[model samples]
Target: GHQLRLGVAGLGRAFTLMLPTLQQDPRIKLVAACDPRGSARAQFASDFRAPVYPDIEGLASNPDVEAIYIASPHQFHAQQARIAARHGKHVLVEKPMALSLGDCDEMIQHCRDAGVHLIVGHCHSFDTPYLSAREIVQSGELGPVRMVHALNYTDFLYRPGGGVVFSQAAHQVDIVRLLVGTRVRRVRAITGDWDPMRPTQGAYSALLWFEGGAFASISYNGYGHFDSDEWCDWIGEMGGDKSPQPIWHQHFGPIVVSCERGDIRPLPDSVCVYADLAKERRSLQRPVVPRFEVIDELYHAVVNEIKPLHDGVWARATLEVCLALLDSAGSGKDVELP
Candidate 1:
């Protein structure tokens, strides 16, 4: 009766966007859920016709569920994963992995001790366009990578304990690390905070120096301004010069990777490669159900006993650079990575 039965630890926000993928994936079934909101719990129970609870303990302890998706707030991810793992359930935690490196360490250790898989996800690196861009860079189609620049501007900063860097910048950072294909050797960054009530960084610009001499500049602004989509031609998927959909397919804004012989850019659903006075469009194999890779990664890890794509160690590495962004911003000096 257990066909990878799963439980959702949180109810709204990112979980709502991920709903479509979960609904269509027949390999896993949603059997239990938990949420702080009474209404969300009721609706979710009605949707799945299953048991719903008001806390992680209830959902994680359910014998019917073998896995838990921690869609809760950033501050709660580490604690929640520990809870789920202790109850003998694999965990798929949302990004930033946790606020601090110590918290990340605890999650990894606890899951390891419990003999369960831990995966950090829902990042843009799983997006097909970015994956395609990585392939282009890896194939040496564009020669030696020189630099990378990514910009994502929006009115997207309405969360708790998550500044733009903690919130939006993970996707850019993950993508940069993926395409650069190496470890980050050093980091330097500048960040801005404007509102008194909102104690979070609203804008950020960082320069990441990678191993073997490649570098990337990652910038993000969530102070409610111009759209970066239009800057990337804003064509095809999104309607330009109009009120955009709540979630556009172009999640990474627009990223350009410049190499010795040419350049590569990832669009909403495709990638464009410019080389030697010629431009070509590239595509990758994608799940028919959008945003399905993360769940697939978790499912395979659980059943196949293999490490997930964004494993605990990899997520901790990304979180390290995130902390450095703030450290460098505070000290006005470059931060060295270990």
Candidate 2:
């Protein structure tokens, strides 16, 4: 009875992938949806028994809807969030926040002025392993972090509407920031646009220098050569299908942190600690915690009148890193940040 009536905007590929998880949340009541496509509209209406709208204006005006989950394209994120704020509805926007930092600022300002909660969905950062990594770094047992290394391989850039920097590197950027917890002083990188027809770069490798002398080595290739999904298991218990092979285990990738005293490696299911190079590696299996869903967090934020962890400002910071990666790659020189 205390559930939040949430409307979904844009039921495309992203929303389609999230449908199952959204339906499983007990605190959510999918009451309305907005999309231009007729099939998407019909799907939302039939599945949730809710009225479908043609645009955010119609969806926001619905009195029964307390919040909106925005899965629209990057270009539409800021505007739709502003509309929801004006209508006094909380917002949970998909990643990237917007295409530009200016748009991100405007969305944050509008939500603040309207007295509503705005949560940017950095879903992967909320995962148990990443969260544990943050705690380990802050705990100081690993000493001050010296450097970080992260990499992923996927067909993300070659896909329709794909962008190597924003689409693929966004995850690495956010995770680096979460673990490092400092402003990047400078960024240097190289990005390749192998396919001239596509507007976005196809691959990139970046180096970030944090303000306090910390460094992060971030790299990703979306050229479709190698698929990590098939070889590795990092999709941890989101209720997705499991492999029949007994060897299949959850592992996102090797996110390694070199600290002053030792090295820390956070896996999909456990955290590995190398107290000394001469000693055997020690791994602590992380307790299985249900992945924190943005919808549930938004509901609590609305009811309790509190700001969620992944707010507009946080999202803006991540976007800053992303843009810096592109800038560094474009100019063929290091870009300094504020």
Candidate 3:
């Protein structure tokens, strides 16, 4: 009924990317921002003309805001989101929603009890190609799809402790969960060494089993080469795109979708959808970008009192897959979850 009053919490790269999107949307009014990083907070407030806060309480206490975006460090996502929910604000928290599934459950319950919507900031599911692939899988063209092969590798961002598994790999795992669309039947993870200067969170290979025989495998290496666009080259190698594969470049890889009957390849930002089967190779019509689609849809749902695509139930299920993955890495054994 009214404009979406928004608070840009957390002054990291996430908020940086989302800032423009929120600002450009006539429906959303940027009201405030928060960050403990002094440089980030100063830069964000100055850039957006939004008030900067040292913590979530300051951001959530603003009565003018309707939704508070939580993009703080991975460790703080659950707690900050809960505080926003308690303040009767819809929340959009960044990926790997929490360090533990228990915390994710608690945040979900808190938001539901407060009568506010909880949206996990799983951005890839909002991106263009991923949505295109999802359409193919859901259209039954894949004929009961059995397995998915996905990998996100790069020397993109540097994390203090782990190089690949916790930082970049989390997104790949979450995307797999979104594509497979089922409870994690089993998860197995193992890592490899890289960068003596790094603290030993090596390349990771994660195997996931979904219900009804759907399966997924993700291999990621963040320590490989920082110069290249991380996943973009891999995306090209997967035959998703044929553009000049730059070494030591900068960009994300294309998300490739392989179904039982056919395969689809989509680039990072472009709507490149290639579908191929045994005897015939064809390209499918592109679907709307889920980024704008899902967000606008959620806002519309709010107006109509309907539900979002990735509401409380969906958010929890996605986080469960993440926890199972972390568990597998911790225990060095296959994790079977309900």
Candidate 4:
């Protein structure tokens, strides 16, 4: 009655990053795992004391798991989610949710019909600085957000796929919607897929108009020449912890929100506000716990029977903006959202 037994797909890097979260959360139990290295691995089951799983279907069909965590490639997300739903298990799918909106819709409908739940993420929106920044914006201390400028640069493309938009901007876009506190109405974008050897988009500049009068310019370059963390006033994108682990290669932000009364910027473990024209800075402090946001949301969704912050619908909305950027870039025109 106290735990949500979880079966996981993908025993690679995605799962590696998620282990601390799964192990530390008392509300969760890692009951089973599948998708081993090169079709098999025994130490996972023995080390974790979980069941063997050479394939996803075995994990999805298991009776022990109340929920399934799909950490496999985004390409396999839709199918894995369907399998879990069909077997009456809730799903916590990874971000960019699916490759296509139609696939997202199918996953949503599949879970709905099966009477289960689907939450998507691992987004930096869950990071404390952004969370705290939204608080200041909502508190009216900073007034209404009028404009947002988010820029990130890294070597994301040379080692990636779907370019920066699908592979990386999901983090920035999700955080933008969180602070802007509304839906995007339209988008215009231009992307650079330079370096034929890399064969994917490595950079982009985009303008997103929100439902309100507010808008944002989002720029990202994954060509590896620079790192925003060098300039972000914070070292870690995931959190501001003092751990020895290196911050993930994909560093985000230096995001600046311009408000009617003041400006806001998120930093490591704290959010800074500039309310004075003379440029006085104030810090609102918070310490982001690694993976706590993701696990806590899922805990409530299952144990408390409530919707999570990144439930399928909310995540799908995030997906829409991410997908729209591509469409706008392809057509050389602004794309409108419903």
TM-scores, one per candidate:
0.91, 0.88, 0.81, 0.91
Score residue 155 of candidate 2 by CA lDDT: 64
In candidate 4, which residue ranges exceed 4 Å CA deviation?
A: 36-40, 158-161, 240-251, 277-289
The TM-score of candidate 3 is: 0.81
Write candidate 2's Cα lDDT for 1-338 as tens digits. 48878889999877776675567677777899999898889888997888999999999999998889899998999999999999998888888789888998899999999999988763567655676778889998778888999877766656663366775677778778878888878889988777666666777788999978899998787776866544334442242334341221233445788889888776654567778654433343433223434555676788876667778898888878888878887776898888
Candidate 1 lDDT over 268-293, as tens digits, reads: 64578888979987654434666766
lDDT of each: 0.81, 0.76, 0.66, 0.80
Model 2 clash number? 2
TM-score of decoy 1: 0.91
For model 3, how does the per-residue alpha-carbon lDDT over 28-147 read when each residue is reduced to its tens digit? 777788887778778877877878888889889988888887877778887898889889888888775776778878888888888888877744565545655677678887665577
Ranking by lDDT: 1, 4, 2, 3
In Å, residue 238's CA in model 1 sits off its true spot by 9.5
Candidate 4, lDDT over the whole model: 0.80
What's the lDDT for residue 219 in model 3?
77
Candidate rank order under TM-score? 4, 1, 2, 3
Better of 1 and 2 by TM-score: 1
Score residue 130 of candidate 1 by CA lDDT. Answer: 75
Worst 10 residues of 2 by lDDT: 240-249
Name the candidate that leads on lDDT.
1
Candidate 4: tens digits of C-alpha lDDT, residues 189-223: 99898687877777899999997799999999988
